[PDB]
Symmetry: C7
Subunit: 171 residues, 7 copies
Amino acid sequence: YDIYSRLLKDRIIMLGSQIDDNVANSIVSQLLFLQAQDSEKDIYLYINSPGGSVTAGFAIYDTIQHIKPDVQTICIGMAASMGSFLLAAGAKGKRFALPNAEVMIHQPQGQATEIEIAANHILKTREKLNRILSERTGQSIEKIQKDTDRDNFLTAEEAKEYGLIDEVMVP
Amino acid sequence: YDIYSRLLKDRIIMLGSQIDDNVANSIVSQLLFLQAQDSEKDIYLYINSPGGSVTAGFAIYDTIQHIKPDVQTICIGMAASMGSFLLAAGAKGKRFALPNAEVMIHQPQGQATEIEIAANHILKTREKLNRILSERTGQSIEKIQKDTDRDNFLTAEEAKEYGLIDEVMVP
Amino acid sequence: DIYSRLLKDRIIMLGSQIDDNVANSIVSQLLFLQAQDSEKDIYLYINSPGGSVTAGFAIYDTIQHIKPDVQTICIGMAASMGSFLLAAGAKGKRFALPNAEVMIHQPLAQGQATEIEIAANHILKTREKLNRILSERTGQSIEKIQKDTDRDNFLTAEEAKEYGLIDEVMVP
Amino acid sequence: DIYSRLLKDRIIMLGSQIDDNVANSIVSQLLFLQAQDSEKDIYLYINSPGGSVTAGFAIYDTIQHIKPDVQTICIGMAASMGSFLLAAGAKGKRFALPNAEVMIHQPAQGQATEIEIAANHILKTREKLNRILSERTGQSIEKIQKDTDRDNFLTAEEAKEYGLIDEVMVPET
Amino acid sequence: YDIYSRLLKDRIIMLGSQIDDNVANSIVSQLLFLQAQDSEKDIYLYINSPGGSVTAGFAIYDTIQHIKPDVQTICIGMAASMGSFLLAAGAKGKRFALPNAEVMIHQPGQATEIEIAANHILKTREKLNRILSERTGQSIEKIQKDTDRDNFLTAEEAKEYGLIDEVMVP
Amino acid sequence: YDIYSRLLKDRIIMLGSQIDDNVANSIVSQLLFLQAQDSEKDIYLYINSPGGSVTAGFAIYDTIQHIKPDVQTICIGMAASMGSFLLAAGAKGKRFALPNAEVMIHQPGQATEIEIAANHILKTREKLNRILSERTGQSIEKIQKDTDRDNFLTAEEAKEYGLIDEVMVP
Amino acid sequence: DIYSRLLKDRIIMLGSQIDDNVANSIVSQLLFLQAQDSEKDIYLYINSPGGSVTAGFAIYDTIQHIKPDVQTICIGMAASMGSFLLAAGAKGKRFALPNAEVMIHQPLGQGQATEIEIAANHILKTREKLNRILSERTGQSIEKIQKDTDRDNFLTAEEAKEYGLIDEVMVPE
Ligand SMILES: [Ca+2]
């Protein structure tokens, strides 16, 4: 679509699909582009994703944390698994959801190849997810481990109360 | 294509297919872009939709309510399921249909993934749909509960009488 | 390429089966042309076997809604919803080329219509509203239209003028 | 690409079977060119094995309706509807190159829709084709009836003497 | 591949595939475009073609002869059947091949049902031989024999035969 | 896509897939283009790759070493097989990984029969090992050992191993 | 989109099997750059496992024909027709990168060659002309080349220089 090109001028990135390497490459490239345009101005990352690959999600995570600009995260529909992980990873005080957004932190995948899955288990990237979520939500590692194994769906309000977002955007 | 892009210049968006995640993302992006262009001028959402997925439809709904410009809604052919919900969700006074439009309130999937179905069951989106509809139509939620469970087809004039739209546009 | 250039001349071509995509595109073009200039005429050329009635009504309603006069010109053919849109053009401004073939017969499902669309038509009785508009725009009685839209009667351009479906056959 | 640049030169290329898609494309180019300038000649090159008669009649009628003269020029082939459209050019301005192959035989051809085939027979389009061909070749309807019911191939010079075209374009120098 | 539109600015046309109706329509369109742009300047037609449809080849042949500009023909790799025919059809004195080009005048075709019927009733095989005779300076009798056999010709032998005017030497 | 052309203006090259011939040709072309634009300014090569073909990987490797501009390598996500080899081949002091990047040096990615035959005859594994040994500061004995096993490394471990120079801290 | 931009720098990339499509592309780019400037060098980068000899001879002939010098650089692999086009660069201007792989073997006859192409190869004895050309350009005896062309002969960049296939190995800096 020609629309996502216009939105880059507004420093808006839409993450509206399952997260695989292709998507990760696209989002990362968009993040580096906007940093090159203007290293100071905020970026707006709208999220409607059911999740996906963990190494691909970490690629985006790492790029959000590395670049100079504050990356604002705004969930518009769903944020599950890596979707919700990236939602929580946005700039402090600047993580949002619309009132009818659905958030799940269950971390179960996502067209991941042999090499990726091998890396995940060997470098125990799941423990790294749990540890990062714990830091960014304030929850204990033990509560994070428990909830990421479970299939709990949170309303926007329940997501704020959990510490995944900062503010529910009520009209 | 080039017509919708040039139509976007007039702050017109066309919602003319079933609503899935792709469509929602597109409509949401278009709404955010038009807000970014001018935060004050009306937006015209044209609707010819058999409906689609609830979580996709709520993403559009939330965006309409979130943005500063008021989104005028106009049914040209059909609004069924989520299509009619979106029609009823336009700026008050600014909801329209052409004389031979067909509106159906019945909410039944729109290629909704199993994660989305689970979320909607758990978060009780169906009761929420009924409630929002009753607020936007002026009907009691009991009337809404009944009418959304049967397949009730309404003319543009009947949908006006029902409160789904404000006016039938005059030839 | 050619169609975007024609759009500048306020010319819209309807040269396929009418389904929802086509209807959405035709509706869009009509809206764009009204936004471009509200006073100048639009030229809708029709070569269509017909299709979906709900899609056709979407185009019909838009033609009647928009400000500019919409001229309808049949090239090749106008069957079912195709003939309905041809008869729906501005009065005094509905045309057919000499060898055009017009058919009023409304089938008994077309335009690869969805389950939801078929149900709406039978419940809201669109077949009767079609027959009503046709009689109003041709000058024939409702019982004449009712019989003719049930039959597979093919009309020449001149017979279609006699019928009231068009205003004039265009002279070479 | 090349075809859009050619359209600036008021050149239209008809190089395939005739269906509704092609007919609509040709019809639109003719209307565009008339909208550009209504006095200057149009140059319609024809290399076509034929196709749908109702699609063919749409092009035919459009040629006769617009104000500019439509010169027709056969390169390669003009069979069935192709040769009918060749014969449909502005009289005096129908051409073929020396090695062009013309066929007048009229055979539902070329992915014609079910409604179209029925329309052909009911409105008796075959009689109209014959009568028009007769009118613009100068040949009698009886001769055209016989010649269109046989697989009848003609050279460019034979097609000229038959009256289908006005001149064979012999190359310089 | 947008290289071909760039070459068109330099009045260069590439015929580097099997000759069918689509290729014919394409080549004919470029030739007409190049005449419209400028009717005086030479056009350069490069050939690497195994041949193809006789009626499609004839459409190209006629357009070459009909347009005002001189069309140079340059064989770069192969010119077989209709390919070699179109090579022999260039402006006189301006038909070339590169030193390692392969040229075959044997005529066996990627035509259609209607096209095949036309070729045989109108006797296009005789028209090919006749034109080959006119443009090579060879007799109808020799050409008839050679177009029936699978004689491959070097670039030098094609010059000697009269299919080209000069071999293009490094 | 389309974003990648804009990134080229910033002298950024994304290597975010398996390395086959088409990918190598593309990366090599982007490197040559950027050198041609400016021979002095740094190039940034972002790597997210499972690796792939040895011949294709060496094509990129050689071009990185040949061109004038310093090529910075930045691992985002993963660098395995040729991916990690290309990561280790960045300009000295300008090889980086993000905190959560996964690095694997193990050498076993869609390559023709000719290429596989070439690899074993011309002893390309011995070449890889020697080059890795030269750019990490680890011995050939050590690198021969670690290339055989499926040892994954964190960004910090990759730095300690000598594959990268720094981890990029948020 | 880099290739079109790269073409502004007089750079051509041959990165696949050689067939008629590839050859017609390369030939076109060579002819384009001549028309652009006939004096400045052209840079042909080679990463090719070979292909059709007819297609390769088309490129070869065009390289020799045009005025600009064509520099050849092997980046990854040059096999069969790939090697041949490598050895065919301007004298003193044939290069390979240090880890390039070169094979002179000319296969059992490649690259989707048509029955017409294969017939011409055998009749016009195209293999003999290849061996003759390689001999002239490597400075080796036709006897040695005939032997090495019949074996699967993989060479390093340095060995290719010692053979005479290239003039220099491009040393990195
Ligand atoms: Ca720099």
